[PDB]
Design a protein around this ligand. Structure first.
Ligand SMILES: O[C@@H]1[C@@H](O)[C@H](O[C@@H]2CO[C@@H](O)[C@H](O)[C@H]2O)OC[C@H]1O
Ligand code: NA
Length: 330
């Protein structure tokens, strides 16, 4: 690694390079982080359930540690995430009798959470994924069902962005989602963000999660999505990048290691993807991987629990994989 190029330096004039982490992985992958990234995202500790597990009970300890680490190494921090249909405690949507609260009550709770969380990190966190995955991933409906939407109404996103803006008007606010390059969903995301922007809502960027496979989405689909979203005038962040060795239909659990073909195709895939990102450097300002080395990845248990995946640029021994070389040589 002594003569290895540094990711953040290679892309210094293109975009920040980030990694998702937690207190445990910061320790385990500390040197890799210090040598390669200039942006950090909390993989789980800034989500609702990990910040306000019980009403009025805020547990900022883990998030504070992540922010302390980032700031001590001059790394930016992306806040993830405020309003999402997942990892949000049941108390949020219920009253004392266990019944769903009213629109006004949920809005009060949303505002309180957003205000308390955003104000705490104001000046340290430069952007926030305010709304996460509100768009439907299947069907003809624009929006996915969720208790937020059910109780408040479809304007729940407008409210979330306005509350976040009030808490920190200098932060860049994002709508973040996955399968962002499949045409049907891309158009829903485009339509949604355009509608918000057309109402003057403070949504500054779109976060493309990029939980991709070796084959999907195609390079043309990626290009088309970047251009489609960029046409809205918003900033673009690739937020949770990883390249799975398994396609959606591939639920095998026997592979103890990736084949030479999979490693090679992954190398080619990463080189093609980064070549495209660099081409669109004028609109893409940050590229964050959902981790940094294969010794830690949520893909080991999702969508198939108990297996192993090798989605990143460094292997389990924290050594550069073939994908690393193609990615940094674009
Ligand atoms: O540890 C796991 C996290 O890595 C996981 O993170 C989510 C991955 O899917 C994305 O669409 C989400 O934005 C991101 O937060 O969440 C589950 C947790 O168990
Ligand atoms: Na850029």
């Amino acid at each position: 690694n002594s003569s290895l190029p540094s990711l953040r330096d290679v892309f210094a004039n293109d975009f920040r390079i980030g990694a998702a982490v937690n207190p445990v992985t910061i320790e385990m992958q500390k040197q890799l982080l210090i040598d390669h990234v200039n942006s950090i995202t909390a993989e789980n500790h800034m989500k609702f359930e990990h910040l306000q597990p019980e009403e009025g009970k805020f547990t900022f300890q883990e998030a504070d540690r992540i922010v302390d680490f980032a700031c001590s190494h001059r790394m930016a921090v992306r806040g993830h995430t405020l309003v999402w249909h997942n990892q949000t405690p049941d108390w949020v949507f219920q009253d004392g009798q266990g019944h769903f609260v009213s629109r006004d009550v949920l809005l009060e709770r949303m505002k309180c959470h957003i205000s308390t969380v955003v104000r705490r990190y104001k000046g340290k966190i430069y952007c926030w994924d305010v709304i996460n995955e509100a768009v439907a991933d299947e069907g003809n409906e624009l929006l996915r069902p969720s208790k937020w939407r059910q109780i408040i109404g479809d304007d729940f996103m407008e409210q979330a962005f306005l509350y976040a803006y009030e808490a920190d008007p200098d932060a860049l606010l994002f709508y973040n989602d996955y399968n962002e390059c499949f045409p049907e969903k891309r158009e829903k995301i485009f339509a949604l963000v355009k509608s918000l922007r057309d109402k003057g809502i403070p949504i500054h960027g779109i976060g493309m999660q990029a939980h991709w496979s070796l084959t999907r989405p195609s390079l043309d689909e990626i290009r088309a999505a970047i251009e489609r979203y960029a046409s809205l005038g918003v900033v673009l962040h690739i937020t949770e990048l990883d390249v799975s060795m398994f396609e959606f239909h591939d639920r095998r659990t026997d592979l103890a290691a990736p084949t030479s073909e999979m490693i090679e195709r992954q190398a080619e895939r990463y080189g093609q993807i980064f070549a495209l990102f660099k081409e669109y450097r004028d609109v893409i300002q940050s590229v964050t991987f959902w981790g940094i080395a294969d010794d830690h990845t949520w893909l080991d248990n999702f969508p198939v629990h108990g297996r192993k995946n090798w989605p990143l640029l460094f292997d389990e021994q924290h050594k550069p994989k073939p994908a690393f070389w193609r990615a940094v040589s674009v």
